[PDB]
Amino acid sequence: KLFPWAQIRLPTAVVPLRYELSLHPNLTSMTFRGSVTISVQALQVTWNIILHSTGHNISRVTFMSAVSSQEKQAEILEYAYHGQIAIVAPEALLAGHNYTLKIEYSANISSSYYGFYGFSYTDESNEKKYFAATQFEPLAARSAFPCFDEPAFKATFIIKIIRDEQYTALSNMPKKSSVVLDDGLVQDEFSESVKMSTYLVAFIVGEMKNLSQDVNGTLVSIYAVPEKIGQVHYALETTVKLLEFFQNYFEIQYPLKKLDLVAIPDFEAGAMENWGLLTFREETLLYDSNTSSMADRKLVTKIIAHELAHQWFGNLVTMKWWNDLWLNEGFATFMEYFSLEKIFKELSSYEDFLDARFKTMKKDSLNSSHPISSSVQSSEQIEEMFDSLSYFKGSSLLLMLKTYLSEDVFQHAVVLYLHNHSYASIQSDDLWDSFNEVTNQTLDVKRMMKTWTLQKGFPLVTVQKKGKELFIQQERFFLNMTSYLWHIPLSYVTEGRNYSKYQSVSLLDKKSGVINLTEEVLWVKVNINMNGYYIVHYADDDWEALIHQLKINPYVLSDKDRANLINNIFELAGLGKVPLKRAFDLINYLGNENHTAPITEALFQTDLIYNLLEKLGYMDLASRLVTRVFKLLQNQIQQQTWTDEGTPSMRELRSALLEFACTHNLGNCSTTAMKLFDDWMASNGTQSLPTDVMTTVFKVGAKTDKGWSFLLGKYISIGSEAEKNKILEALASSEDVRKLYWLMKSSLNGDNFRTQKLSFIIRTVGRHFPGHLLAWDFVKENWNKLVQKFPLGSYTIQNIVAGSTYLFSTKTHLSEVQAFFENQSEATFRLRCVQEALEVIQLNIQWMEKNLKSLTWWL
Amino acid sequence: XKHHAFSFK
Ligand SMILES: *[C@@H]1O[C@H](CO)[C@@H](O[C@@H]2O[C@H](CO)[C@@H](O[C@H]3O[C@H](CO)[C@@H](O)[C@H](O)[C@@H]3O)[C@H](O)[C@H]2NC(C)=O)[C@H](O)[C@H]1NC(C)=O
Numbered sequence: 052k053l054f055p056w057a058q059i060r061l062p063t064a065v066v067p068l069r070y071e072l073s074l075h076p077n078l079t080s081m082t083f084r085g086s087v088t089i090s091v092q093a094l095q096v097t098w099n100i101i102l103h104s105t106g107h108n109i110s111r112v113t114f115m116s117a118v119s120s121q122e123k124q125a126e127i128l129e130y131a132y133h134g135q136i137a138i139v140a141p142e143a144l145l146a147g148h149n150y151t152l153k154i155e156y157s158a159n160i161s162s163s164y165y166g167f168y169g170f171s172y173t174d175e176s177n178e179k180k181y182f183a184a185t186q187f188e189p190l191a192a193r194s195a196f197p198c199f200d201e202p203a204f205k206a207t208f209i210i211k212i213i214r215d216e217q218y219t220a221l222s223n224m225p226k227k228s229s230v231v232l233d234d235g236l237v238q239d240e241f242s243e244s245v246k247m248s249t250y251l252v253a254f255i256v257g258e259m260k261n262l263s264q265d266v267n268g269t270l271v272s273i274y275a276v277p278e279k280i281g282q283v284h285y286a287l288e289t290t291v292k293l294l295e296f297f298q299n300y301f302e303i304q305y306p307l308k309k310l311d312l313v314a315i316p317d318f319e320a321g322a323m324e325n326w327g328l329l330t331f332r333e334e335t336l337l338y339d340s341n342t343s344s345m346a347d348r349k350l351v352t353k354i355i356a357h358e359l360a361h362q363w364f365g366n367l368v369t370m371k372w373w374n375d376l377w378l379n380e381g382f383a384t385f386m387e388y389f390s391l392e393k394i395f396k397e398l399s400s401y402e403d404f405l406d407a408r409f410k411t412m413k414k415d416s417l418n419s420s421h422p423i424s425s426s427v428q429s430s431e432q433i434e435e436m437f438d439s440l441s442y443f444k445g446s447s448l449l450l451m452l453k454t455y456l457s458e459d460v461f462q463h464a465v466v467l468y469l470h471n472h473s474y475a476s477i478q479s480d481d482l483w484d485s486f487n488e489v490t491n492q493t494l495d496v497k498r499m500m501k502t503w504t505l506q507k508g509f510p511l512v513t514v515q516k517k518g519k520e521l522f523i524q525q526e527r528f529f530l531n532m533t534s535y536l537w538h539i540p541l542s543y544v545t546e547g548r549n550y551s552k553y554q555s556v557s558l559l560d561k562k563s564g565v566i567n568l569t570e571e572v573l574w575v576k577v578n579i580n581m582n583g584y585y586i587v588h589y590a591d592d593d594w595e596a597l598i599h600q601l602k603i604n605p606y607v608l609s610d611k612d613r614a615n616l617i618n619n620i621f622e623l624a625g626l627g628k629v630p631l632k633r634a635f636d637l638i639n640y641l642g643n644e645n646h647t648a649p650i651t652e653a654l655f656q657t658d659l660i661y662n663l664l665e666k667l668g669y670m671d672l673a674s675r676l677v678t679r680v681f682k683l684l685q686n687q688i689q690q691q692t693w694t695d696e697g698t699p700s701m702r703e704l705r706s707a708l709l710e711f712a713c714t715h716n717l718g719n720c721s722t723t724a725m726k727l728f729d730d731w732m733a734s735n736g737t738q739s740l741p742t743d744v745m746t747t748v749f750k751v752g753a754k755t756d757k758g759w760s761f762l763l764g765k766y767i768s769i770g771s772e773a774e775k776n777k778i779l780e781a782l783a784s785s786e787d788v789r790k791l792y793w794l795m796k797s798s799l800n801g802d803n804f805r806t807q808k809l810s811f812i813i814r815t816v817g818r819h820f821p822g823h824l825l826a827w828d829f830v831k832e833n834w835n836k837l838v839q840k841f842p843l844g845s846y847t848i849q850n851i852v853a854g855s856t857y858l859f860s861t862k863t864h865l866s867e868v869q870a871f872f873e874n875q876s877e878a879t880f881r882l883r884c885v886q887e888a889l890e891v892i893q894l895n896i897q898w899m900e901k902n903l904k905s906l907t908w909w910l
Numbered sequence: 911x912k913h914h915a916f917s918f919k
Pocket residue numbers: 467471481484485
């Protein structure tokens with residue numbers, strides 16, 4: 052019989068209710084055998100059950116009915132196209148009657164790292180151990196066991212895996228029945244999983260050691276490989292405090308007895324939020340309190356908070372389809388940075404969030420941008436949806452939605468949202484619906500969010516204060532080469548009477564509006580702490596009004612405010628809406644700034660212009676530029692110390708200012724670094740380097756054939772991977788072109804550097820002048836082997852191309868890049884990343900056309 | 911999840 056179902060999506064007909072999954076995995080032969088009991092129910096009438104299965108050889112497929120424990124055969128129907136199978140059920144099953152479906156099969160554990168995958172490694176004591184695991188998001192679950200692989204099909208799961216002795220079997224639900232067998236082949240059984248989606252099932256097998264402590268009735272525990280079990284003491288201490296936070300904030304308890312964060316011992320692992328079985332990359336969980344830095348700590352906190360908050364948003368409440376993927380990931384990313392601002396207020400993670408949002412708007416403002424709520428009908432369109440825009444734009448709205456409504460009003464809308472839809476499937480509108488339950492009254496709708504969800508980019512708010520009235524105008528943020536309108540939650544701040552800290556909130560929802568100022572005011576800053584996902588372009592007089600204010604007392608606003616202004620003006624000066632001289636006229640206050648967040652972002656914008664110029668041929672112009680910026684920050688830079696002393700926020704600024712003054716060579720900043728490196732290099736690297744200066748010091752030393760050759764030694768040897776990654780950066784900061792090419796050519800086939808490091812190398816080599824042309828040449832001249840080693844549409848093959856072309860700014864280069872991709876295929880030439888790259892270079896030219904002549908008549 | 915470098919993109 053030919054396949055009775057011809058659509059992508061599974062028919063609404065049959066529905067799973069209870070899953071039983073029994074497996075026997077052979078880790079040393081990369082194969083296994085498994086059995087699946089699928090308690091299905093009927094809703095409509097059909098002669099076939101349609102579900103998902105890929106890459107299997109199936110023993111028997113048996114059928115059954117209610118209260119008659121006999122089972123009759125029923126042939127199978129594979130199509131492998133959509134990854135669908137069909138049971139040609141003999142008795143036309145009917146609405147209301149549950150049926151049990153059993154399938155036993157054999158298949159391969161995966162050689163790659165997607166689906167049910169295994170891998171090998173070596174021990175502390177050089178003993179070749181083994182390991183296996185799962186990554187099922189978003190469509191991999193069907194590769195393991197035949198099932199209903201769509202997210203809106205929640206059900207229960209009984210998992211059992213027949214492992215070996217010294218191994219540890221783990222899965223979503225806790226162990227309960229372990230029953231040794233007669234060959235030393237222990238078998239475990241895990242509890243019936245609560246109602247959850249297929250993609251969220253997990254089970255792993257490998258030699259591990261626990262570290263636990265149960266709080267409020269829930270066993271939190273960081274499982275991992277034997278040796279590293281000592282470095283997981285920050286992981287656990289944090290997971291408790293954060294689980295304690297989320298349970299309290301959501302007013303729902305974590306509906307499990309245990310919570311397992313396993314640090315998979317592989318560099319190509321998949322971090323994932325499986326219920327009860329959280330997965331991490333080993334590197335990204337180990338935090339040594341002694342040797343590790345702030346960037347090491349911030350990451351480990353941030354990545355746990357994201358995985359935890361996912362238990363609520365994404366596990367409990369799961370979206371109905373991948374078009375609303377942003378609902379989980381946008382929320383997980385919001386609760387991520389939000390939990391930290393409440394519990395880990397030391398980290399100053401709001402800074403990270405701000406810069407993150409910065410870099411999101413720059414990408415959302417492009418033409419390649421796709422709205423977060425976007426029709427998804429294929430499977431590559433699904434992979435696509437796991438992009439920056441979903442995580443951070445989505446996050447930005449919830450923040451904008453948060454700071455608009457009361458903080459308390461945001462929580463209530465969540466608590467109720469979480470309550471109403473628990474263990475069910477969600478839609479974008481359904482979040483909005485339980486978001487308008489109150490105040491108390493439906494004083495406002497969330498049709499307001501329907502412009503932010505359905506169309507790409509963000510508004511450009513234009514502002515003209517002409518006395519006591521403030522004229523607002525909105526428009527699409529476009530980059531020269533209708534539709535739109537937004538429901539914008541406007542906020543503003545000014546000083547009025549006795550420095551009256553006046554702030555207010557509005558909602559422009561038409562092409563034009565006006566805000567009524569209480570008094571007369573000398574300056575007015577719109578969009579406070581960039582809570583709103585948009586850019587504000589003031590009029591000439593009001594720009595210059597804020598600049599004057601900044602030069603007098605720039606602390607009447609927050610650090611976020613000040614950072615936001617620097618961002619917006621440079622990005623406006625880019626598109627031509629403002630002369631670049633005014634952008635620099637704004638930062639002139641920076642001589643009197645002690646807050647990192649404005650300084651980092653200001654150092655970013657100017658470093659970009661320096662690098663863009665440099666790669667053309669304007670070395671003089673570029674060098675005169677960084678000195679202008681240096682003189683502003685001269686005091687701060689001198690005043691810095693080469694230690695690890697201060698708040699996270701302050702140690703960040705230290706790393707920023709130092710890495711800066713050393714890169715272009717400014718003041719004593721070098722030599723000091725060169726001194727330290729000589730000391731460190733002398734002691735065979737037994738001297739502790741202050742991880743805040745570690746990268747700078749490493750880089751400076753790497754400019755000598757000796758110091759460089761040393762740092763290569765300390766890479767092929769030592770184990771500190773965060774240190775190893777700071778060393779590699781230095782290696783690829785060498786000006787000796789030969790050394791740079793040797794790095795790229797080596798890293799490719801993985802001789803002294805893993806091929807995962809290749810992207811990082813090509814990028815770093817290509818940011819600085821000597822490597823610049825050499826990086827892009829490496830990409831072209833080895834493109835075929837690049838496409839072999841990386842899926843032609845994974846984050847790596849994009850990161851490489853963007854990383855090696857985003858600095859070209861000439862018509863001539865534009866044609867060269869375009870032509871190279873043309874001469875491949877059009878199926879590569881029309882690929883999201885490559886078309887986007889061309890847009891960047893096009894925009895780079897536009898920037899030069901608009902500002903280069905302007906820039907020259909300074910000095 | 912989606913961490914490596916960048917954040918941003
Ligand atoms: C639990 O979540 C339900 C959503 O799944 C929610 O129901 C929704 O209720 C609103 C009104 O309260 C309905 O909205 C309507 O009004 C607009 C404008 O008039 C119309 O265009 C719509 O078609 C609709 O008539 C939603 O349609 C409705 N959603 C669903 C799926 O039924 C419940 O209120 C929530 N329950 C609790 C106790 O919070």
